[PDB]
Amino acid sequence: PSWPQILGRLTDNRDLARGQAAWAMDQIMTGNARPAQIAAFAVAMTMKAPTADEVGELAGVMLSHAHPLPADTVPDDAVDVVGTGGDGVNTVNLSTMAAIVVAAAGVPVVKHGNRAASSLSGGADTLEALGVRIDLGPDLVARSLAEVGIGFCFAPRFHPSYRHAAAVLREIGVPTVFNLLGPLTNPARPRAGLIGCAFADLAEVMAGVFAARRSSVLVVHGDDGLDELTTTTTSTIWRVAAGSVDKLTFDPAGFGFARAQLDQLAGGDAQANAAAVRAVLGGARGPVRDAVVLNAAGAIVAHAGLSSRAEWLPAWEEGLRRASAAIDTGAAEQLLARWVRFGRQI
Amino acid sequence: PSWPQILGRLTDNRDLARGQAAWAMDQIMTGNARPAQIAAFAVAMTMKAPTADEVGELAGVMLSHAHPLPADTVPDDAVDVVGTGGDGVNTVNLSTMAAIVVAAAGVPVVKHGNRAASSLSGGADTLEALGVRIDLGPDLVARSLAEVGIGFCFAPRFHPSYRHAAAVLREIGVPTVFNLLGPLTNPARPRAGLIGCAFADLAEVMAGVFAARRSSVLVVHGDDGLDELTTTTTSTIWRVAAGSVDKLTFDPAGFGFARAQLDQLAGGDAQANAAAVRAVLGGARGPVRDAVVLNAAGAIVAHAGLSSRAEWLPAWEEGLRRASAAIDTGAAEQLLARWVRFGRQI
Numbered sequence: 144p145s146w147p148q149i150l151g152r153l154t155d156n157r158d159l160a161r162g163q164a165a166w167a168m169d170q171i172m173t174g175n176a177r178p179a180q181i182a183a184f185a186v187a188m189t190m191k192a193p194t195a196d197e198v199g200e201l202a203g204v205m206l207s208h209a210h211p212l213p214a215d216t217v218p219d220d221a222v223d224v225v226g227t228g229g230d231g232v233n234t235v236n237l238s239t240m241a242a243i244v245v246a247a248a249g250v251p252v253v254k255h256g257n258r259a260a261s262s263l264s265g266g267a268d269t270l271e272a273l274g275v276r277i278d279l280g281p282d283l284v285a286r287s288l289a290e291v292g293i294g295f296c297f298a299p300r301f302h303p304s305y306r307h308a309a310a311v312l313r314e315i316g317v318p319t320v321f322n323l324l325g326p327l328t329n330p331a332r333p334r335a336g337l338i339g340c341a342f343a344d345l346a347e348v349m350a351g352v353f354a355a356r357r358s359s360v361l362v363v364h365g366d367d368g369l370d371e372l373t374t375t376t377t378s379t380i381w382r383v384a385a386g387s388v389d390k391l392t393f394d395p396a397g398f399g400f401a402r403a404q405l406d407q408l409a410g411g412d413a414q415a416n417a418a419a420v421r422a423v424l425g426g427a428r429g430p431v432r433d434a435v436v437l438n439a440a441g442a443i444v445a446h447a448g449l450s451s452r453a454e455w456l457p458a459w460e461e462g463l464r465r466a467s468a469a470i471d472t473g474a475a476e477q478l479l480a481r482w483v484r485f486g487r488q489i
Numbered sequence: 490p491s492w493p494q495i496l497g498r499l500t501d502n503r504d505l506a507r508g509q510a511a512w513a514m515d516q517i518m519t520g521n522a523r524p525a526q527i528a529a530f531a532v533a534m535t536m537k538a539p540t541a542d543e544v545g546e547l548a549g550v551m552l553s554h555a556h557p558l559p560a561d562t563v564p565d566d567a568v569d570v571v572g573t574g575g576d577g578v579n580t581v582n583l584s585t586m587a588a589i590v591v592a593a594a595g596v597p598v599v600k601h602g603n604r605a606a607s608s609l610s611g612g613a614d615t616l617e618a619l620g621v622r623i624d625l626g627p628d629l630v631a632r633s634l635a636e637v638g639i640g641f642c643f644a645p646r647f648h649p650s651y652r653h654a655a656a657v658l659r660e661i662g663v664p665t666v667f668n669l670l671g672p673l674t675n676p677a678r679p680r681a682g683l684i685g686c687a688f689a690d691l692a693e694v695m696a697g698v699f700a701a702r703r704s705s706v707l708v709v710h711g712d713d714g715l716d717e718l719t720t721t722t723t724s725t726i727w728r729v730a731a732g733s734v735d736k737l738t739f740d741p742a743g744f745g746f747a748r749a750q751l752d753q754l755a756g757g758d759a760q761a762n763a764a765a766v767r768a769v770l771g772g773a774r775g776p777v778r779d780a781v782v783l784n785a786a787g788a789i790v791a792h793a794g795l796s797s798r799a800e801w802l803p804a805w806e807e808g809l810r811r812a813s814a815a816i817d818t819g820a821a822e823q824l825l826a827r828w829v830r831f832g833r834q835i
């Protein structure tokens with residue numbers, strides 16, 4: 144195959160043949176692709192409308208080039224809590240906060256992330272400011288996970304071959320199909336997760352990729368455009384279980400959640416967002432907390448769905464019970480401190 | 490305006506705002522665009538179907554950075570004979586053949602061109618293979634048009650700022666909206682022409698750009714896929730006249746043209762394309778001659794179209810009759826030779 148062959152086809156508004164997206168991404172990962180070819184491919188693939196197979200081959204190749212974690216160090220039931228980003232809105236780090244709470248409820252967590260692309264502080268940014276280390280390689284992410292209950296995979300450190308593509312996509316400035324990869328390329332390959340998507344027309348495609356692996360994942364998009372489960376309004380959820388997707392709308396009001404204004408969830412620089420995490424874990428009641436509990440519940444229901452013998456509602460109310468208890472007992476706050484303390488000790 | 494604004498809008502399948510296409514082009518020409526941005530723009534402008542205004546803006550910006558010809562050196566009734574190519578044939582043998590016939594019939598021709606991408610011989614290549622100096626500055630092109638009756642503007646010499654876009658578009662290696670520009674960025678700004686386009690949908694767009702200029706133009710797509718008037722079957726013509734456009738069907742059988750086969754008309758190697766020209770200008774009667782004569786008449790008919798008193802069928806017979814004569818008298822063969830001598834006498 145070739146670039147004009149592949150680019151020609153996409154610009155003809157045609158789905159690619161099996162293996163074509165993989166060859167293209169492999170060319171990219173292996174540094175054999177000129178910056179203009181990367182850009183054309185990325186834009187062309189977005190405007191055509193990508194398929195699950197296509198994006199699955201993109202994520203597949205990427206993973207196959209990624210640093211893996213050591214064998215028998217990632218639990219069978221580990222969850223991820225990560226979004227695509229591209230909110231447009233500049234919220235406090237909801238995914239990061241819920242991750243800590245989830246791990247504090249004793250659900251193993253291997254989080255993928257990096258810095259903000261558009262926002263003032265990313266997950267990795269906010270974690271850095273807290274004094275939790277985001278540099279850790281495969282072996283120490285494995286250690287951290289077993290020793291603290293949570294581990295953090297920093298995307299650049301696990302995905303060096305993405306460097307070629309990453310610079311190019313920054314220059315473009317528009318989001319593309321590539322903005323989907325982060326959540327689909329966690330190097331630990333955890334089989335569950337809560338997965339945020341800022342682009343409502345692409346979210347089904349992510350769900351499609353997760354269903355191919357037979358993951359238990361809720362792909363989420365707030366109807367306010369949030370790549371999290373919102374408290375402002377309702378959220379659309381593509382539930383991924385048993386290798387099939389199904390669409391839902393989710394209403395916090397049915398679990399007694401006060402509706403909220405978007406700007407109550409608004410965020411700032413790293414220090415500020417790190418202050419917000421200390422606040423919430425510390426027990427500050429209000430909008431931000433509600434948001435964190437909600438999403439933390441979400442991930443826990445995805446965990447629960449690893450088992451086929453599971454109903455939606457009883458699992459959500461268990462989830463909300465546990466996220467809330469994880470904060471209120473101080474266990475969440477403990478865990479963060481335990482985790483910082485882990486990093487300062489090789 | 491902005492790159493992210495313009496690229497995002499395109500990726501939403503939205504037509505641009507008045508001025509944006511121009512701003513994008515203007516950044517490219519000025520050197521203010523990343524190759525990643527050039528690539529995203531060219532791909533997206535294509536997949537979202539481009540409009541006449543958008544392409545006019547791109548053409549206009551390009552023309553406003555170009556070296557013009559000296560004042561009062563291009564006659565008001567000058568014509569261009571040219572195709573988009575990318576027919577995948579090629580047509581270069583036909584366009585340069587008709588161009589010379591036309592000039593030889595006493596219609597000033599100023600052609601715009603480049604060395605080929607897809608085919609072995611292209612407009613400039615074939616010209617260069619016949620001994621013609623294709624790379625002359627504005628003054629010498631005017632002197633050529635004055636003395637020889639034809640001039641060729643070499644797109645690299647006349648559009649220095651376009652260098653960036655060309656390098657980028659070579660790498661993506663597939664047709665984009667930028668492939669319509671050549672015919673619409675003649676530095677000599679000639680107000681008539683026969684304009685071949687391999688893209689049916691884009692032809693109508695090119696036509697509307699020429700309508701905006703009040704040029705008298707026949708945009709032509711061979712219904713056999715050719716970017717010239719074919720003799721293989723019927724053609725589609727977009728008659729541009731009085732700032733308006735009429736889509737037509739054209740059949741050369743109504744002038745006694747035998748149906749040829751597509752593989753008797755196809756351009757080839759530059760050294761081959763050259764010999765074919767000597768062959769046919771020397772008097773080689775056949776299906777190549779036929780189709781040169783046809784396209785040459787189209788060019789002359791287009792020239793006739795500058796007067797609103799011009800009528801269609803008589804214009805075509807005067808056209809056919811004059812092109813035939815230019816060949817048979819040897820005026821055309823003789824014109825090629827004076828054009829070659831001209832270059833050798835500077």
Ligand SMILES: O=P(O)(O)OC[C@H]1O[C@H](OP(=O)(O)OP(=O)(O)O)[C@H](O)[C@@H]1O
Binds near residue numbers: 236264339
């Ligand atoms: O910067 P953007 O492209 O707008 O993306 C929004 C943020 O989301 C990502 O983190 P992640 O989703 O892992 O965690 P978060 O939701 O807690 O930030 C990333 O780190 C960004 O800072």
Ligand SMILES: O=P(O)(O)OC[C@H]1O[C@H](OP(=O)(O)OP(=O)(O)O)[C@H](O)[C@@H]1O
Binds near residue numbers: 570605606610716
């Ligand atoms: O890009 P390609 O597909 O190789 O096209 C071959 C040639 O056709 C065009 O020139 P010209 O208009 O002189 O020839 P045509 O009008 O017959 O296409 C184009 O500028 C090339 O020189």
Ligand SMILES: [Mg+2]
Binds near residue numbers: 370
């Ligand atoms: Mg998120």
Ligand SMILES: [Mg+2]
Binds near residue numbers: 228230234236237238
């Ligand atoms: Mg977010």
